[model samples]
Each structure stands twice: as structure tokens, then as C-alpha cells.
Target: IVGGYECKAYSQPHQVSLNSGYHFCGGSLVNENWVVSAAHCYKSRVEVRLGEHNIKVTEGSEQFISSSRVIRHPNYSSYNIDNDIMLIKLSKPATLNTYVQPVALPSSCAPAGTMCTVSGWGNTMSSTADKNKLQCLNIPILSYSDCNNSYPGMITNAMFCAGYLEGGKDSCQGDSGGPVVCNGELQGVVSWGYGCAEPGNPGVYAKVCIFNDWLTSTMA
Candidate 1:
């Protein structure tokens, strides 16, 4: 996340690295065998790593799992960029432990204006490369009308925006497909935005609550 710092180990156990030979996107473990992310982060070949705090060293708590398939939303498209969520099916179940766990999805929408936390191994700045240690930031959830003011009609009903209205804060490149948790509940999936920490622009995310049925069915 741009303007974020290195997060504590095990602070975000559900956070996962969705890699295609290399760490390309951040993901959240929704279950022992499933990970949640953005369709735009989709790759033909991907892998999920759990219980990871530092990507450089071999950690006893980490679990590197293979991806069996990627279930992108049926309505997903780059043209309109609607329904930008996806689920990654693991070839095998991840062993649960204090350092590895799944995050609970929100039963109801986190009301507009609710402050949420988002974490990832994405770039801290556009000029820099992706970080090896996990990083986190707190960004307020923007209301549909409020967010639309920044992006206009591009802000769809299936999406919610977050970050600073003044900008200088956002999810940047390589942070795509990470989790946005509010009150310990998964509220959104990091989607996209105009650029890193640009003025008047906020980061967009896929509203996880709206796709509860799709998430359940895909994992089932």
C-alpha cells in the first residue's frame, strides 16, 4: 500500500501472496482451500502463500499452495471493469494454525464512511518496486455518491472507493487483489485506481458483501 509501513508478523495471517512465478498480487485466504482477490489481478498460472510476513526467508509457519483454478466473476470485464472479484481454488487445503487462517467475510455491508484497513506487499511508491515485508494502511470507506464525485459513472454499484479525498494515499501497483477488512470482517477486494496516491483520487475495490452468494457457490 502506498504511504504504508511494514506491518507486524502474524498481524494479518489471512493475507496471502498470489504469485505467478513471482509475487504479483496480494490475496486473502477465505478458506483452507480458497483465496479471494481481484479479477484484474487474474493470471493463467498462480500460486497462493499463507502465513507469510517476510517473502525473503523460509518461514516455518508459511504454507505455499498450488492453485487449481481461478474463478473470476461472470460479469468481469476490462472494458467496463465491473465485478472485479475472483476466487482462487487451492489444489490442497492449507493447514490452519496461529500463523495461518482464513478471514471472515462480512455478513452485511460495512456502512459507508466506515474506516477500514488494507494490507499488501505492493509498492509504497510508484517509483519503487514492491516491498518484501507486508505493509498496511487505514483508509475510510467512501460513500457511493462521495466516491462517484471523484470517478463519476465509473464507480459502479458493485464497487466502493476508499482512501484520502486529498489523495497521497492509496493501493498502488503490485497491491492489487488484497483484502480490505473492516471490524475484522472482509469488506472489499483491492481493485484499481487512476494512479498511486494521486490528488482527488481514491482506490477502488470490489464490494465483497454484494458477491457473498457468488463467493460461497464458487468455493463450494
Candidate 2:
């Protein structure tokens, strides 16, 4: 879903907005009916957007889905940065179209070294936040050993790593909760990182594959 400036597109399947007027990235679907995002995106007056790039304008031919119920991971802790995922039940089903469609979840386990794609409307090249048109990029999966070695006491089995160490491409500040899709299946969600595009520091993600059981249990 990543695109160049000449090709503007929604980075992920979902966009999450907080009561504070700030937004985070996310994903969603039809059968699921719930918008999946980061636990940090959950707050009063949260909303989910599909299709359109501009959040303010509804004039475009895109599906705009809002929410009524917000569900964060039960064990989520910002202090410890654990269980940083969430789900939101849309007030209604979104109208599907070519521009707007639900990304599929992984049917089976996603193994290490699996390549994936991540998208977001956050900063294109900056490490800070940007409320702009979405961008997407392809990244490679990192093994837990490599991740733990790179991060040193930070990466967990609950998490996975993606991106290149050479710099010039990565998920930045406002890209949180966006999907890390691989082989048409979602393997991870944009979570955090040391800094954008830093050498030896690929972006960290919430390992969706490892939490499928918990997610299904909660969403069920």
C-alpha cells in the first residue's frame, strides 16, 4: 500500500483518531466489523476512517466509517509498552470499493524473515508526526535473535521487527497501528522504534501473529 508522492494513497486499511484531535494508524475489515489499531489510539471520541485521504472532506468517493465501541488489549500497559493493540466496533459497516477494502489476516503462523508491507499517512520522511496523505513501503522481517540483538533487552516474543538498517525508509512517529501485511496477510502492526530510518534500528511492530489467539478470543 506504500506509495510515492506522485501516487498518494491511504497507508493502511484503517485510521484511528483520539479525543485529543491527534490520529494514529490502524487496520479493519468487513466480517470483523471492528477497526483494529494500537491501544494508544483508544480514547474518548475516537473515530475510524476508510478510503479517503483527507479526514475533513467527505466529498470524495470513499467509505468513511466511524466507531461506537473501542476495545483495547486487556493487559496493555503504556509504562511497560506491553500489549499495545486495540479494536473498535464501527457504528456501521463500511461500503466496500476498489479504493477501500479490508486487509486479510494471516491464516497460519508468520515465520521469521517473512517480508511484509506497512502503510501510513504519517510523516513520509521525518521522524516526527505528520497528518498528511498516506505512504506505503516494503520491509523484511527480522528474526527474534537479530531483533533482540539489535534492540538489546527491548524486543519481546510478542513483537517483531521490520525495515532496513541502511536508512532512508521507515515508520515514523504518527504511523502507529498501521498494518504490516505479508503475502496478503497481516503479520504485524506498526508499534514503535528507536528513531526513523536509523541504521541498525529497524521499526518495531506488535506481533499480530503471536496474538491471534488473544485477538480472536477478544473479538469473538
Candidate 3:
């Protein structure tokens, strides 16, 4: 979820190509070296493209090195849809260019009610995925009290919530592990949702800030 916006000018911005030739939405540089994405999106072989507008046919301006060493959270659970974060170590560090740059991760902290942004190539509308362009949305961070009231027996301190209550704009299928960035820092990762834009259901995300230690340890 780089730049907290859609791909208006650029076509295949931060698009990762899997071994199967399928491309998935991915985020830009985390430490100017590694690319972060969802574990479920990982395959045995992959490549990352940056600074392009048309993904269907246009080639990107820069091609960052991608490795097969995908490290997912140890407690990752697909069934429960928790701890779904993963990091991709680039074969070599990426050089910051006009169209290739890294987004800043959350450094300090976020208080309850803070607003964040998420971007991806998921479904533009609920129940449908966009086959062409990327989509983005601004979601406000929900307090634990309010989150618990909405989704009981599921949300944890290691998780966060964001979405529209009326069920309109949100990240749906194909948006997993995209960054939920706030204040230039990566606050969370797109994890799961019970449904696409349900009236009472807010999308759940893996709290990136909470897993900083785990990320450092694993990456080290």
C-alpha cells in the first residue's frame, strides 16, 4: 500500500509477478531493500516491478531483485486469518529512483482513532475484483473497545480494524498483506474480512507495529 493512493498515473505500480505468471498487489521498499507482502501471495519464484502505469502490457521502469526466501510470521494461520504478514528479501538493495522509492514505516506510535490509508489491486467494489487497475481507500483506525464491540472473540491486541460501517469502500479479495500505513509508518497489514463491504463488518489487519520485534528477529 505505497503512497496511500491508487494507480492513477502509474499502471503496474508495486506489482509482483508470481511463478505462475499471475501478478499480485504488493507494497514498495520497507528498508529500501526488502519488499513486504502477504504470505499467501508468496510462491516459489517471483519478481517485482515498479514505476509503470499499465500492468497488462506496459513494462515497469525499474525491476527490483526478488528472492525466494519468504519469511512468514511463525504463528501465521490461514484458517483463522491471523498473523498473515510476510517479508521478501530482495536479491540486492533497490536504488531509489524517480519512480522507485520506499514508503516509511510507522516509527513512533499511533493512538486510537488515528486515520490510516490502504492501497491495493483488490476488488474496486465489494464482491468483485478489479481485473485492470489498482484501488485504494482511507480507513480510520478503530479503538479496541469499539472493535471488540463489533467483532468479538476474534480481534486481538496484535490486530487493528478499519473500513466503512455502511459497507462501500474497502479492500476485498486479492488485497491481503497490503500495507495499512499511517503517518508515514506501516501500522498494519491487510489480513482478512468476514465479507466484502458488509454493513457491520470492518476489515481486520495484522498490526505491523506490534510485530516489529518478530520482524526484526526473523529478518535478521
Candidate 4:
């Protein structure tokens, strides 16, 4: 997260860290047993940590759960990062508390110009060290027209771009699969981009509204 600030500990109760020995990606708890993340962040096996603040230390609030299943969107395309979303079912339902809860899914798309927040333990800058505490940046949702102009013939209905086109702040490495919330709803999932907040290249995300039905049927 370039040009971001550390959020208050446990402020984002639904935030989670996907691990393969260390934090590799971020995700959001959508229910007691389900998490939403980016398809490209998937690993055959991983441990999911909830209620994490400083990942390097085990806070008493943390819950380390093994995934019961990991399902990536069937139409996901790594080459273009299309449909870059995934789901993870926890082996056991999470125990919710002040420091751990689920985030509500979006009921509608966040329109252009909507201010949102994206959080993760991603790099603060290109090739920089990963942050121990979760970092967050406020970014505006760019209109599809504007985004497409930046990367013509690239942005699709399943994806949208956020952050500054002039560079600075954005979700970066180790942040893929993290939640991008707008109006208290989960609207985007960190997916991919050209580089870490480079000019004319905002971070692209999986448009959550496009997968609502898919998420419902799968979870059902």
C-alpha cells in the first residue's frame, strides 16, 4: 500500500491474512466460514488468520484456521486477470468477537467517484518491506470510461480500477485478495495492475457486484 497509513488495530474486523508460512495475500471474511479473495492469490493449501494486526506477533484475538476448500472463479483468466476472484471455506466457523467479524457483501456497485477504503499488509512502495500492521488508503472509484482510457481494451465488466492515475497510493504485492470497501460494503477485491501505483496505471480489482450471484450459489 503505497502512501498509505496504518489503521487502528482491529478496526477492520473482517480483514484476514492468507498464509503459506508467511502472509502472502489478504482477504475478507464474508461469513463465519467463508472468505473472499483474489483468484490469483490462491495456493493449494494455506492457513487463514483473522483478527490480525501486527502479523509478526500473535495477538490473542487471532484465529488460525485451515481452509476446508478453495474455489477460484471458473472463468478466471490469469493472463488478463479477468474474473480474478476466489472463495475459501474455513474448516470451522469463525468465532466472532470485537476483533473478528464478517463484512457485508455489496448489494450494488459503487458508482464512479465513490470514496472507498482498501487495506492490507502489502508493500508500502515498490520492492519495499511488507508492513507488520495493516495499512489503508482512501481512493476514489474511477469511472469505467476513465479507467478504460488509461488501459484501453483492458478493463472489463468484471474488473474496475481505483487509486490515483498520477501514482502514489494503492494496494500492492502481498495485498492481492484484500477487501476494498465502499459505503460499508465489500465492492472490490485486489487483483492486479501494471505496477505499484504507477502513473496512468491504477490498481485493478475484481468487481464484486458482478459475482454476487456466483458467490451466493456457491456458498449456498
Q: Pick the candidate with the highest TM-score.
A: 4
> lDDT per residue, candidate 2, 3-120, as tens digits?
2231255444443333235455555552437666777766754656667565455647565556778788887878646677877777787766655667766787677777777776
lDDT of 4 at 66: 96
lDDT of prediction 3: 0.65
Model 1 per-residue lDDT tens digits across residues 122-161 = 8887455447888889999987887899888898878999
Candidate scoring better on lDDT of 1 and 3: 1
lDDT over C-alpha atoms for residue 177 of model 2: 75
Per-candidate Cα lDDT values, in order, are: 0.87, 0.67, 0.65, 0.92
- TM-score, one value per model: 0.95, 0.84, 0.83, 0.97
| Model 4 per-residue lDDT tens digits across residues 97-185 | 99899999999998999999999998887344348889988999998987898889998899999999889888898899999999999
Whole-model alpha-carbon lDDT for candidate 2: 0.67
| Candidate no. 2 TM-score | 0.84
Clash number for each model: 0, 3, 8, 0
| Candidate 4 TM-score over all chains jointly | 0.97
What would you estimate as the lDDT of candidate 4? 0.92
Of candidate 1, the 10-residue stretch with the lowest lDDT total is: 122-131
